Structures are given as structure tokens and as C-alpha cells.
Coordinates of C-alpha atoms and ligand atoms in Angstrom, one line a residue:
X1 CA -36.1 -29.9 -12.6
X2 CA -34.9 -29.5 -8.8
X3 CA -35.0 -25.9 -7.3
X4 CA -31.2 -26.7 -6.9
X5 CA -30.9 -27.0 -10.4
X6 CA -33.2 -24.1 -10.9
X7 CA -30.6 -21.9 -8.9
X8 CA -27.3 -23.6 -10.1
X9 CA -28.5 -23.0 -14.3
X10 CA -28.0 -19.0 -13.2
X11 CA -24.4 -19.3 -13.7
X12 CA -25.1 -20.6 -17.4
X13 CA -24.1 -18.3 -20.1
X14 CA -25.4 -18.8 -23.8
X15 CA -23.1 -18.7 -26.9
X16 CA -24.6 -15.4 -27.6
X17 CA -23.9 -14.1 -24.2
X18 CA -20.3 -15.2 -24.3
X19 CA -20.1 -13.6 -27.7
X20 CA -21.5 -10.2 -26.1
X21 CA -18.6 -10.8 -23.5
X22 CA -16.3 -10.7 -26.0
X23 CA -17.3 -8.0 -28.1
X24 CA -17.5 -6.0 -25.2
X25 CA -13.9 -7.0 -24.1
X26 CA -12.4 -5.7 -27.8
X27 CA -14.1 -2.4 -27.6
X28 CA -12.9 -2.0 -24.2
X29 CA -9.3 -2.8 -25.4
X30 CA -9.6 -0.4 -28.3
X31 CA -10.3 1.8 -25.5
X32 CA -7.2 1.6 -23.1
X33 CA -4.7 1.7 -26.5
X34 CA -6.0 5.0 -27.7
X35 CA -4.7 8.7 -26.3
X36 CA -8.0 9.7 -26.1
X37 CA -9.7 7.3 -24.2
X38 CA -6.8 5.4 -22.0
X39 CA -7.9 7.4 -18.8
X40 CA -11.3 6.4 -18.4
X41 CA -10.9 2.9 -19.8
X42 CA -11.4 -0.1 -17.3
X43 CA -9.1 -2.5 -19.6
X44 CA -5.8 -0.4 -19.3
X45 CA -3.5 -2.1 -22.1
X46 CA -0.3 -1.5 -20.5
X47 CA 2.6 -1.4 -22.3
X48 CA 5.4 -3.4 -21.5
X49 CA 8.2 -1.8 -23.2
X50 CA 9.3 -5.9 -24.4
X51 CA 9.5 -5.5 -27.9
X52 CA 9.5 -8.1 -31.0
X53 CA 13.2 -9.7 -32.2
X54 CA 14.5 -12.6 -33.8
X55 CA 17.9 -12.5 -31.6
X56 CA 19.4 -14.8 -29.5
X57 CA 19.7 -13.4 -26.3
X58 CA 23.0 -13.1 -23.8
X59 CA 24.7 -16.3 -22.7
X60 CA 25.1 -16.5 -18.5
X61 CA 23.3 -16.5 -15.7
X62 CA 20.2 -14.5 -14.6
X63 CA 18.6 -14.4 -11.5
X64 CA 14.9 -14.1 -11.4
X65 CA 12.2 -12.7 -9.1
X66 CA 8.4 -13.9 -9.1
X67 CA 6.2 -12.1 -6.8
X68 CA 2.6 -12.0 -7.2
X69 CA 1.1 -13.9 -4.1
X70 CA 1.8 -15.5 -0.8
X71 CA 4.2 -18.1 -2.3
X72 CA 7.6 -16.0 -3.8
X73 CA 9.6 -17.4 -6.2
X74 CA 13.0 -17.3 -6.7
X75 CA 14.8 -18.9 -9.8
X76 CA 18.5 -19.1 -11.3
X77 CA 18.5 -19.4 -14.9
X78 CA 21.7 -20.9 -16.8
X79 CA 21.4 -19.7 -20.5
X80 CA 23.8 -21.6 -22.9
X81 CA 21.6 -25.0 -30.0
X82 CA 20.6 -22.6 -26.7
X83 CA 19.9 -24.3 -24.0
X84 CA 17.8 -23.0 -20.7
X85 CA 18.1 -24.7 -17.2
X86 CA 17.0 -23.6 -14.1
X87 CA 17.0 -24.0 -10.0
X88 CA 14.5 -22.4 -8.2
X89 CA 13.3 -22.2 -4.1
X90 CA 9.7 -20.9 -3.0
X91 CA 9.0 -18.7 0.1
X92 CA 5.7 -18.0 1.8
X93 CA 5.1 -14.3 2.6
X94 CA 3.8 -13.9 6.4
X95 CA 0.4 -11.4 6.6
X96 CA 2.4 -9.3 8.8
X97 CA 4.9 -8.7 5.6
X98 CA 2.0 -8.3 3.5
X99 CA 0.1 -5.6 5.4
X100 CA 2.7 -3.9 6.7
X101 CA 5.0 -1.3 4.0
X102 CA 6.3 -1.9 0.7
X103 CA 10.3 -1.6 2.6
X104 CA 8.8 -4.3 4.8
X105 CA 7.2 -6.9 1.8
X106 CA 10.9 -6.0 -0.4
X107 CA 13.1 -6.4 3.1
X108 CA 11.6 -10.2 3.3
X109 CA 12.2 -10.8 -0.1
X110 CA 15.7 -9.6 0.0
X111 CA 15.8 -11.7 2.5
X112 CA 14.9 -14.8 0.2
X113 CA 17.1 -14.0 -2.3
X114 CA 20.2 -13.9 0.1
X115 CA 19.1 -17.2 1.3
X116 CA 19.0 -18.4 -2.3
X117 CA 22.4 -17.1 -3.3
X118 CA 23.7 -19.3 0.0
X119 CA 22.1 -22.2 -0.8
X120 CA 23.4 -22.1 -4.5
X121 CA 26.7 -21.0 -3.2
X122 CA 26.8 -17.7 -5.0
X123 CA 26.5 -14.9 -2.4
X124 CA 29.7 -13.2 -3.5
X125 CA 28.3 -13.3 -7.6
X126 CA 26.5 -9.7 -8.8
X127 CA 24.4 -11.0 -11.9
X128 CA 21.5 -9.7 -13.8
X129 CA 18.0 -9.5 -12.4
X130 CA 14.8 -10.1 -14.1
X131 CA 11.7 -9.4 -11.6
X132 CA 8.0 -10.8 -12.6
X133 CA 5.3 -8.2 -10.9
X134 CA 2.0 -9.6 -11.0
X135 CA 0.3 -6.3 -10.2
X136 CA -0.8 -3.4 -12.5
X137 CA 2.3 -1.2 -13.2
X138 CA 2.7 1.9 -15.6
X139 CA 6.2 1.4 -17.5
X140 CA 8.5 4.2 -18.3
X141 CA 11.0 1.6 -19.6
X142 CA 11.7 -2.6 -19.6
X143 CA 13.6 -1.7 -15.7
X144 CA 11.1 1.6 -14.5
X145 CA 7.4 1.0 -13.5
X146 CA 4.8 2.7 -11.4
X147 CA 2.9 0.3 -9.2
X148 CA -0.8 1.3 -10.1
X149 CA -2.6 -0.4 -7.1
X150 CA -2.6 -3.7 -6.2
X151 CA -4.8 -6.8 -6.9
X152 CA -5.4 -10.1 -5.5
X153 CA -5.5 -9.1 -1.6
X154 CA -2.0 -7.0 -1.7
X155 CA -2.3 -4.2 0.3
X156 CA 1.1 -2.9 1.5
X157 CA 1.5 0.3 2.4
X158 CA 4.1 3.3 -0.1
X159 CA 3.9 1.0 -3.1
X160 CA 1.2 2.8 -4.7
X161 CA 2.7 5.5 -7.1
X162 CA 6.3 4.7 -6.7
X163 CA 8.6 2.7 -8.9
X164 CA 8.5 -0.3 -7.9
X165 CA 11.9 -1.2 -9.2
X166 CA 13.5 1.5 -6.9
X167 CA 11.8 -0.1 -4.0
X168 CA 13.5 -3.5 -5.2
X169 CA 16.8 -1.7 -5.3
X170 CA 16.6 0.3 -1.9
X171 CA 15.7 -3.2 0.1
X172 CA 18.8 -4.7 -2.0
X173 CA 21.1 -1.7 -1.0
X174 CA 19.1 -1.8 2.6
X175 CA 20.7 -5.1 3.1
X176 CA 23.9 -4.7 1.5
X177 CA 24.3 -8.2 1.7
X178 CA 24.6 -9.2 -1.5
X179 CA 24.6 -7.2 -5.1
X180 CA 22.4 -7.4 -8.1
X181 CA 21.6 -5.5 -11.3
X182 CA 17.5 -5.1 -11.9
X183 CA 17.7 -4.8 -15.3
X184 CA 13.8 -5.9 -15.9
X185 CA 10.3 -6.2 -15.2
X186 CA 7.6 -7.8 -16.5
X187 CA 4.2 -9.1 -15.4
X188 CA 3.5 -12.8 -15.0
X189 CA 1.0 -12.4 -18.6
X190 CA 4.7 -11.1 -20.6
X191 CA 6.8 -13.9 -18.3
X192 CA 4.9 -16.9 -19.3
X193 CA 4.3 -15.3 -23.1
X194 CA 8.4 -15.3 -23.4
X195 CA 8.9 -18.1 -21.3
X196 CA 6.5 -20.5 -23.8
X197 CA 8.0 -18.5 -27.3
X198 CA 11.4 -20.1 -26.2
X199 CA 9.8 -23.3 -27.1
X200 CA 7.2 -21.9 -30.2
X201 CA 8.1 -19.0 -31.5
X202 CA 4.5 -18.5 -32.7
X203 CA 4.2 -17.9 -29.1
X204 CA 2.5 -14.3 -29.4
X205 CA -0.2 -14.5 -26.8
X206 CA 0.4 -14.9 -22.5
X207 CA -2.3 -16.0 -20.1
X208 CA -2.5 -16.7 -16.5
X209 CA -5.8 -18.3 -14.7
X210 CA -4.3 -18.9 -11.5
X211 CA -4.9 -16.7 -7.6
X212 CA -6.1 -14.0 -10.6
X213 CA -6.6 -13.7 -14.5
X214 CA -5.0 -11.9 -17.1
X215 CA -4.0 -11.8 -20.8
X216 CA -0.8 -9.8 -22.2
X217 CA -0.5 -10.1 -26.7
X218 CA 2.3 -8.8 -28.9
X219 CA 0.3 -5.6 -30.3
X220 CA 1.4 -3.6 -33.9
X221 CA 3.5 -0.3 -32.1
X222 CA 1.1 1.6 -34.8
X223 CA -2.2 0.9 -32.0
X224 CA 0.2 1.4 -29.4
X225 CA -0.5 5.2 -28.9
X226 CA 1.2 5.4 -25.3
X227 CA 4.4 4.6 -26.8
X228 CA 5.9 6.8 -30.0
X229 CA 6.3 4.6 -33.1
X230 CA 5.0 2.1 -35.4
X231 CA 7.5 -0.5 -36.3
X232 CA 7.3 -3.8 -34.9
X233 CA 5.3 -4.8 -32.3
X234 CA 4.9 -4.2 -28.6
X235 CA 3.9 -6.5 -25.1
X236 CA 0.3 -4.7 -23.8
X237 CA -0.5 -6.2 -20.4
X238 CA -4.3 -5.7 -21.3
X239 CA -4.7 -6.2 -16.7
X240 CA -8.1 -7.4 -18.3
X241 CA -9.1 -8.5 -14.8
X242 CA -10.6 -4.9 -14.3
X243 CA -12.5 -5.9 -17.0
X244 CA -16.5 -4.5 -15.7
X245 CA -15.1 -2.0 -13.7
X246 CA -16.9 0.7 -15.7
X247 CA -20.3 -2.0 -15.7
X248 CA -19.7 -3.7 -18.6
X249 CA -20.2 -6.7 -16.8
X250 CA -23.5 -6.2 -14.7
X251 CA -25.9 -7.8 -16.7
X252 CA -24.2 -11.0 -15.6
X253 CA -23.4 -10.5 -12.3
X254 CA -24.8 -12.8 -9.7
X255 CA -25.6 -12.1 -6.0
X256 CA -22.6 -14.0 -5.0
X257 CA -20.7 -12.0 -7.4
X258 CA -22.0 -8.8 -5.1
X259 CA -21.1 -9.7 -2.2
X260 CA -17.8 -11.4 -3.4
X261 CA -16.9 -8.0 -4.4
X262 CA -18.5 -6.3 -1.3
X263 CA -16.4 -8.2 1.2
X264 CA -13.3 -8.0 -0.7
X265 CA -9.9 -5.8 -0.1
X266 CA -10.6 -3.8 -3.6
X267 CA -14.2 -3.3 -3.8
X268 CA -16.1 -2.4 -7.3
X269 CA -12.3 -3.6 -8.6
X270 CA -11.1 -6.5 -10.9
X271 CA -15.1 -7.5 -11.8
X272 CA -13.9 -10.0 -14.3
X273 CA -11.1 -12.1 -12.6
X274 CA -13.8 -12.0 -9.0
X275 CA -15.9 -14.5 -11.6
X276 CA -12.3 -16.3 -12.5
X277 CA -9.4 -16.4 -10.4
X278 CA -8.9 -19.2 -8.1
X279 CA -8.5 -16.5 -4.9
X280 CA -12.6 -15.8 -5.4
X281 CA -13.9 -19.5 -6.8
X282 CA -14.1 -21.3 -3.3
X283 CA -15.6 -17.7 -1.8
X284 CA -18.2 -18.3 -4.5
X285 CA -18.7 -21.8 -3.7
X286 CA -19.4 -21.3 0.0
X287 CA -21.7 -18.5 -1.1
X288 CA -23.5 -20.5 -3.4
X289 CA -23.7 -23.5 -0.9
X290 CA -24.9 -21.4 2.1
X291 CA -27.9 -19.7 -0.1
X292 CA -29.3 -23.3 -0.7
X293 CA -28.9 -24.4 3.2
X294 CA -30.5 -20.8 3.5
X295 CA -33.5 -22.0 1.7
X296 CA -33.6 -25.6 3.0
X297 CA -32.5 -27.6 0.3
X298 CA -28.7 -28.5 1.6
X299 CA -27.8 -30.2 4.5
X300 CA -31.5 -30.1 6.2
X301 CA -31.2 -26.1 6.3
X302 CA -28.5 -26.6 8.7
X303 CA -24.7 -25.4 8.2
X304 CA -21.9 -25.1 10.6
X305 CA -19.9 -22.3 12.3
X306 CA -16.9 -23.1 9.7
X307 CA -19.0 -23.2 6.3
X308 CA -20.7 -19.8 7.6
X309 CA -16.8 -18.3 7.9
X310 CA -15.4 -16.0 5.0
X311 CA -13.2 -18.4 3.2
X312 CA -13.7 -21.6 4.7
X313 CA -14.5 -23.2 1.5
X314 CA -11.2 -22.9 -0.3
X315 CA -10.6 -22.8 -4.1
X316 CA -8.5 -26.1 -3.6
X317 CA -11.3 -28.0 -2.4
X318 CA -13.5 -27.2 -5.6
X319 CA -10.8 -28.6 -7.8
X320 CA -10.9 -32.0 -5.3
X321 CA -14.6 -31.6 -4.9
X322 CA -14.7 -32.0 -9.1
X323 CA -11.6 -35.2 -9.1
X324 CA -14.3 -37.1 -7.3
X325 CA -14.5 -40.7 -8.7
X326 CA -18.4 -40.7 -8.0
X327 CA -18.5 -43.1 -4.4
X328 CA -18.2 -39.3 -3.5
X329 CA -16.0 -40.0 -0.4
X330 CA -13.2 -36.8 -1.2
X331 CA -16.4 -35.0 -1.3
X332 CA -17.7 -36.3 2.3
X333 CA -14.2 -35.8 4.2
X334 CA -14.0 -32.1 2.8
X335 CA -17.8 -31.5 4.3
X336 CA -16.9 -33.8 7.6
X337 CA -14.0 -31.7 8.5
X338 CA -16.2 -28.6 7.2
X339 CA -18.2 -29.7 10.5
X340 CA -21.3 -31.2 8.5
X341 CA -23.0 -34.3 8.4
X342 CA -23.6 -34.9 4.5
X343 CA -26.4 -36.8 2.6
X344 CA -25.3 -38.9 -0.6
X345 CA -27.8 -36.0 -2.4
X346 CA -25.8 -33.0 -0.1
X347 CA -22.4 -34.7 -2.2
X348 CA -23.7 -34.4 -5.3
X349 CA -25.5 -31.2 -4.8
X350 CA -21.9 -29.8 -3.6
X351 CA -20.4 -31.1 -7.0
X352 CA -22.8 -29.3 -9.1
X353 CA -22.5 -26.2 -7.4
X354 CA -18.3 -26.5 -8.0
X355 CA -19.1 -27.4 -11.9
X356 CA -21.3 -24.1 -12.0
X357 CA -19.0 -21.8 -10.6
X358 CA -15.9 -23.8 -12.6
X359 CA -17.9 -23.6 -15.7
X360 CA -19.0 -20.3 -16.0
X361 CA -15.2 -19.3 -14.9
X362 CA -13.8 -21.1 -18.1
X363 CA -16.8 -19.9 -20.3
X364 CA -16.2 -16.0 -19.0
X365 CA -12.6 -17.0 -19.9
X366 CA -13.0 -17.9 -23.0
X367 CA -15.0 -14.8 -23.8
X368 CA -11.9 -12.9 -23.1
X369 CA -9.4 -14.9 -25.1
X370 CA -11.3 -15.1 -27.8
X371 CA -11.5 -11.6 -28.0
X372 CA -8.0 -11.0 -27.9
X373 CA -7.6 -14.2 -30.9
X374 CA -9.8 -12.6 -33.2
X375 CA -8.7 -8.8 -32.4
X376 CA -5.4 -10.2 -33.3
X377 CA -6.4 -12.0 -37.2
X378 CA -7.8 -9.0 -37.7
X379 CA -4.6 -6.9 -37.1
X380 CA -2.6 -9.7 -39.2
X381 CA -5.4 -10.1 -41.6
X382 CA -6.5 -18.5 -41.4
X383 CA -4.6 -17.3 -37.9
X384 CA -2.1 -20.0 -36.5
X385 CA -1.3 -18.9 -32.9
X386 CA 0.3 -20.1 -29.9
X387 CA -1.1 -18.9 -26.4
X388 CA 1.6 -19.4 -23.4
X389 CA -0.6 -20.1 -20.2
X390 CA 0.1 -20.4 -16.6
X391 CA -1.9 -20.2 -13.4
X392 CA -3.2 -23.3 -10.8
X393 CA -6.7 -22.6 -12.2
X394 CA -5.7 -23.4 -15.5
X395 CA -3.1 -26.9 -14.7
X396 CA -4.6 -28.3 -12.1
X397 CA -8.8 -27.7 -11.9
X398 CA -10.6 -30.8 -13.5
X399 CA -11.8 -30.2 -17.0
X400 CA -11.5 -26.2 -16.5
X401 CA -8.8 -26.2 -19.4
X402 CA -11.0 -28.5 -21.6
X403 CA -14.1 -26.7 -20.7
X404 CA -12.4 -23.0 -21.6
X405 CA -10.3 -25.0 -24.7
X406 CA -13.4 -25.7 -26.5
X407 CA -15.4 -22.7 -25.8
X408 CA -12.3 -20.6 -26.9
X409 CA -12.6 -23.0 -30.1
X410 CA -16.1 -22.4 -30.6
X411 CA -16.0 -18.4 -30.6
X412 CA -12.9 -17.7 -32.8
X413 CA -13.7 -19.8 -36.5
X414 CA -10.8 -19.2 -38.5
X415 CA -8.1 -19.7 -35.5
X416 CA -6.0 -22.4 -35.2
X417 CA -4.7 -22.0 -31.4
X418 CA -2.2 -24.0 -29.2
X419 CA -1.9 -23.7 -25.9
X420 CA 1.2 -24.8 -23.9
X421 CA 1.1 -25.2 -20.2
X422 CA 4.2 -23.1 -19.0
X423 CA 5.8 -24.6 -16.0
X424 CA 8.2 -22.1 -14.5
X425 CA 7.1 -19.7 -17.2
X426 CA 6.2 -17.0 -15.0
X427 CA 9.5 -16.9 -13.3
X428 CA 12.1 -18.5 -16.6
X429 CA 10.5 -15.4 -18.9
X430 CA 11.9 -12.8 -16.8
X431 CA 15.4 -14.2 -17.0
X432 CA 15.0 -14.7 -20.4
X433 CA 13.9 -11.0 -21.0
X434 CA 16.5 -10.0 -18.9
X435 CA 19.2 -12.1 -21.3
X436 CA 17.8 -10.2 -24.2
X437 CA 17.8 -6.9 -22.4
X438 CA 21.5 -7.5 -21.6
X439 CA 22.5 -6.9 -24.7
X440 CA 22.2 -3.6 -24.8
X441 CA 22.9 -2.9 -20.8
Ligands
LIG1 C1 17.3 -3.2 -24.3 C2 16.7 -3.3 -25.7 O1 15.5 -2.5 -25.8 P1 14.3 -2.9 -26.7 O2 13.8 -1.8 -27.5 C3 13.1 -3.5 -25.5 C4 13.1 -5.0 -25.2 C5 13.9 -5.4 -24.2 S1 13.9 -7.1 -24.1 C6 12.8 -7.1 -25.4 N1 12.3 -8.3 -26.0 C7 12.5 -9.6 -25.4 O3 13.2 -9.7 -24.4 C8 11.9 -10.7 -26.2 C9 12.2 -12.0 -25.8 C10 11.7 -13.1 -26.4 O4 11.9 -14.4 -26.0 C11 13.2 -15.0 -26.1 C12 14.2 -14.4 -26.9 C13 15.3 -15.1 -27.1 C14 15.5 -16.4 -26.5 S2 17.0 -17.3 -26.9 C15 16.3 -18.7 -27.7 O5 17.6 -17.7 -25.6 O6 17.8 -16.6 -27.8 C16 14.6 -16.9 -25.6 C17 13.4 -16.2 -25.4 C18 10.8 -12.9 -27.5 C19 10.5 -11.6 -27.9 O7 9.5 -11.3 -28.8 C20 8.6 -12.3 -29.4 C21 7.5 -12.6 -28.5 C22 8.1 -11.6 -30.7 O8 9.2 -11.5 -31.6 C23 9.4 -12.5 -32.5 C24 11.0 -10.5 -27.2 N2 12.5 -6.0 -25.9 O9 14.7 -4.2 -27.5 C25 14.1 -4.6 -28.7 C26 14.6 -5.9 -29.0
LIG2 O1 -1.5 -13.0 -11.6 C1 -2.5 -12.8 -12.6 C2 -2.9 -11.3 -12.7 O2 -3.6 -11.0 -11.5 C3 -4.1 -9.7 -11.3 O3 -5.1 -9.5 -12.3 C4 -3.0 -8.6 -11.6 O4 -3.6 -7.3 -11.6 C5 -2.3 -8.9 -12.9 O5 -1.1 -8.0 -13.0 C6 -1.8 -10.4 -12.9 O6 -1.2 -10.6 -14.2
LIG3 NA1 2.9 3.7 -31.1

């Protein structure tokens, strides 16, 4: 075996490792559902306040709001034998309303949705709102929600510990521009779970591997002990990306995985999605790739300026890195305009390093998951179960959903899963909560 190899086989986990993972993920879910322990619990098990029904929802229109990274969302959904259509436009978020205050991040998307209503000729129409928030939120209610603290870079300031929902409403009024109703909101998990159980109603289970990595499950109101009663079930937004955030984690972690964490905006926060989510996966890549030029086994010791620069290697170019055909010429022109001068063995080192990092990502994954699967037959006590997913990681990374299908296979035996790709899932569910919601509003 090469040294490179040698280095690179640290990011493999063994079936029993994976199965530790897992374990380790249910007794820290146990943990954020009960009274007693909910405090001190890394795994927070959120609940949503979106309850179980068999009803049809309203019949309209319903506006809906997807925020949970640079790239905003905003979607019309025309609910109608029901039929769902839908017209969305996409915004990117500038740093400086990103960095600045939470009236500054909800002025510019205010801003977007006025733009929206002009394009779709609908500035003078006041309709229902349903808002996806991709950030860990305590819920009063379906339309009331405490912004936690953020994830996944966020850091805008007088967000933390206010409803977030007000802070919608004030930029709307702010404006006065245009006139909505907020009558929901959900995280992206919930969106995509309700989004897929329009099309399979054994849709019970929501999952996003995209910028970040989370998991949200219909849970018996019984285990529920943050909301009073036990009939029917209950959305918990398990925010399992915190997951190791209390150490359950550090017999795995990696040195890259330090200083990953060291250089990041929440430090010694979101352990578990840091070894997922597609915002860390290129970080770890470079830091993986630098360590072997370090000790003089990639690119003749030597890297440049850019591959030495937080961020340079991007998660994008992992995912291209791993759709090489083998003449290993996308691998060459991502390392050219990297600034290096690449051997055919540097190519194919670079590859392996992506499939380590991609590998252990689905593996760690499917440790979660899996978790969640079985946590669930045991609740229900054969389980057929549909899991709604969403997230770039997850759609468009070569062989990551296969990788993370069959390991999720592997740990939970008497499962029989199916997994639909959501397209606008984490935007469409929030309408369609909000049509459901409507009913009694
Ligand atoms: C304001 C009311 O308060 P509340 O207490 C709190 C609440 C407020 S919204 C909500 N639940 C939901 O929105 C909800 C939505 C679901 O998805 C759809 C429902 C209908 C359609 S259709 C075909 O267009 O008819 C499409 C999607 C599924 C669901 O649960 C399954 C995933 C599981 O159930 C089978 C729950 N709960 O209501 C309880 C109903
Ligand atoms: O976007 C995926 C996930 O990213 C982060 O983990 C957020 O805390 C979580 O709310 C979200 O669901
Ligand atoms: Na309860």
C-alpha cells in the first residue's frame, strides 16, 4: 500500500463503527424528546407543531418562502383529483445582507418577494404565506418560532432569540408594499417530508444533505414530552447536525475535521453535518490534499497560493472531480486553474482523496438515518417507509446517494425504505402546510 493510501483509509468506518454511530444517534434522540434531559441534549428534537391528517388541504394559492442559504427561494403554489403546480424565482443574498441585521437579511428578502409578485402580476393579491427556515428554531405554534442560533455560516445580527416570524412580518409592514398573511413555518427537513407525502403518503420521514444535513420524522405525541398530549403524531426536527456537540463523535474525528471546526463561524457546533454537508466537503478536500503536498507525496511538495486559501477547493469541484471519465482531463483543468501543474498520479491521487471524504460523508449518513429507521419500527412495532430527501449533496454528487442507499440498507434489516428525490420540496411543502393550516385560519 502507498502512504497516500495509508492516510486516505483514515476516513474509513467499519460496519461496527457505523453501527456505534447509530446507536449513539438514538440515545441522543431519546435525549432531546424527554423533559428531563432536553436542555443538555446536543440532538434537540424540535417540535414542529405539523401534526398527522388524512385531509385535503385548502384549494388557492400560496405563496412560499425558502431561506436557508445564499440562494432564496421564492415559489407560487396553485393548489386545485388535487393537483399542485408551481412558479418559482431564485435570489442570491449579498454578504453585506448576511452579516449585517436580521431587518437588513428580511428587508432584501421583502424585497424579492415584491419583485416576484411583479413579475407574476400579483402585487395588489394578499395571499397566504408559508416560510421554510433552515435554521434551528424553538416553536410556540405552526406561525411562532424562536431562532435558536444559526448554522451553515449565518450570522446576522437580532435574530437570535426573537421570533423569527415577527421579524418576517415587521420587514413586510417595513415595506408596505405589498400584503401577506404568514401563516407557517417549517424547516427544510418538515418541507421536503410534506412536500414528498403529497406524492406517497407513506412519506413519514424528511432529509436534506445539501450546504448542511438534517433529518425531521413523524414522532407518537406520547414521546413528544415538549408538547401536552398523546394522540397522533407530531413533526420533531431532530437539527441532528449538532449531532457530537456533547463528544459523541470524537473517537472519529480527523484532523481535518479539527480544524474544519476551528476555522469555522460556529466553532465546537454542528460536529456531524462539518463531516457531511456540502458547505465543509471541499474545505475537507483541500485540507486533506494540502497534508499530502505537506509531506511530499502531491504535486512534488509544492502547492500554490490558491490551493493554500480557505475555501479554494469548493464542494462543487469534488462532485466534478468524482464525474471524471478516467482520461482525468475535468480533473486537470480544476487543478490548472487551481494554479498547479498536475501529474497523471497527482489526478488520481485528487480523486481518491474526493471518494474518502464523499464516502465517509454517506457512510456517517447513513449511521444517522438508520437510526431514525429503526427507532421508528420500533415505535410502530416488517417497516415499509418512505424518506422525502432533498439537498445538492444528495442529487447531484456521484454515487453519494448509492453509496449512503446501500449502507442505509445494510444497517436497518427488516426496513423496506424508498427514497424520493424532492425537487422543489423544500419550498412546495411549506405551501402545502400552509393550505392545510388554512383551514382552520
Ligand atoms: C391549524 C391546524 O392545527 P394542527 O393541530 C397543526 C398542523 C397544521 S398543518 C398540519 N399538518 C399538515 O399540514 C400536514 C400536511 C401533509 O401534507 C399534505 C396534506 C394534504 C395535501 S393535499 C393532497 O393537497 O390534500 C398535500 C400535502 C401531511 C401531514 O401529515 C402526514 C405526514 C402524516 O399524516 C398522515 C400533515 N398540522 O392541525 C392538525 C391537522
Ligand atoms: O439545511 C439543512 C439543515 O442545515 C442545518 O443543519 C440547520 O441547522 C437545519 O435547520 C437545516 O435543516
Ligand atoms: Na406529548
Amino acid at each position: 500500500l502507498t502512504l497516500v493510501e495509508q492516510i486516505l483509509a483514515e476516513f474509513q468506518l467499519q460496519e461496527e463503527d457505523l453501527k456505534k454511530v447509530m446507536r449513539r444517534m438514538q440515545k441522543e434522540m431519546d435525549r432531546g424528546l424527554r423533559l428531563e434531559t432536553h436542555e443538555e441534549a446536543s440532538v434537540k428534537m424540535l417540535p414542529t407543531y405539523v401534526r398527522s391528517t388524512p385531509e385535503g388541504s385548502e384549494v388557492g394559492d400560496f405563496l412560499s418562502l425558502d431561506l436557508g442559504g445564499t440562494n432564496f427561494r421564492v415559489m407560487l403554489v396553485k393548489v386545485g383529483q388535487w393537483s399542485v403546480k408551481t412558479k418559482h424565482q431564485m435570489y442570491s443574498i449579498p454578504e453585506d445582507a448576511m452579516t449585517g441585521t436580521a431587518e437588513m437579511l428580511f428587508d432584501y428578502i421583502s424585497e424579492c418577494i415584491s419583485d416576484f409578485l411583479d413579475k407574476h402580476q400579483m402585487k395588489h393579491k394578499k395571499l397566504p404565506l408559508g416560510f421554510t427556515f433552515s435554521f434551528p428554531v424553538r416553536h410556540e405554534d405552526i406561525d411562532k418560532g424562536i431562532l435558536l442560533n444559526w448554522t451553515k455560516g449565518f450570522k446576522a445580527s437580532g435574530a437570535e432569540g426573537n421570533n423569527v416570524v415577527g421579524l418576517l412580518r415587521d420587514a413586510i409592514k417595513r415595506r408596505g408594499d405589498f400584503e401577506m398573511d404568514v401563516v407557517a413555518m417549517v424547516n427544510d427537513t418538515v418541507a421536503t417530508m410534506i412536500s414528498c407525502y403529497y406524492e406517497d403518503h407513506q412519506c413519514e420521514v424528511g432529509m436534506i444533505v445539501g450546504t448542511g444535513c438534517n433529518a425531521c420524522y413523524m414522532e407518537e405525541m406520547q414521546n413528544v414530552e415538549l408538547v401536552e398530549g398523546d394522540e397522533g403524531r407530531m413533526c420533531v426536527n431532530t437539527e441532528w447536525g449538532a449531532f457530537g456537540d456533547s463528544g459523541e463523535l470524537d473517537e472519529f474525528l480527523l484532523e481535518y475535521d479539527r480544524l474544519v471546526d476551528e476555522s469555522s463561524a460556529n466553532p465546537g457546533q454542528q460536529l456531524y453535518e462539518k463531516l457531511i454537508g456540502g458547505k465543509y466537503m471541499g474545505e475537507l478536500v483541500r485540507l486533506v490534499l494540502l497534508r499530502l503536498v505537506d509531506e511530499n507525496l502531491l504535486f512534488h511538495g509544492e502547492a500554490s497560493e490558491q490551493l493554500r486559501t480557505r475555501g479554494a477547493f469548493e464542494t462543487r469541484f469534488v462532485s466534478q472531480v468524482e464525474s471524471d471519465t478516467g482520461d482525468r482531463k475535468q480533473i486537470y483543468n480544476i487543478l490548472s486553474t487551481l494554479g498547479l501543474r498536475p501529474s497523471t498520479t497527482d489526478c488520481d491521487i485528487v480523486r481518491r482523496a474526493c471518494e474518502s471524504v464523499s464516502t465517509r460523508a454517506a457512510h456517517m449518513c447513513s449511521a444517522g438515518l438508520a437510526g431514525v429507521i429503526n427507532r421508528m419500527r420500533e415505535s410502530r412495532s416488517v417497516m415499509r417507509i418512505t424518506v422525502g430527501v432533498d439537498g445538492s449533496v444528495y442529487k447531484l454528487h456521484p454515487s453519494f446517494k448509492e453509496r449512503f442507499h446501500a449502507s442505509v440498507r445494510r444497517l436497518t434489516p427488516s426496513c423496506e425504505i424508498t427514497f424520493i428525490e424532492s425537487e422543489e420540496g423544500s419550498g412546495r411543502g411549506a405551501a402545502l402546510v400552509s393550505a392545510v393550516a388554512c383551514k382552520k385560519a
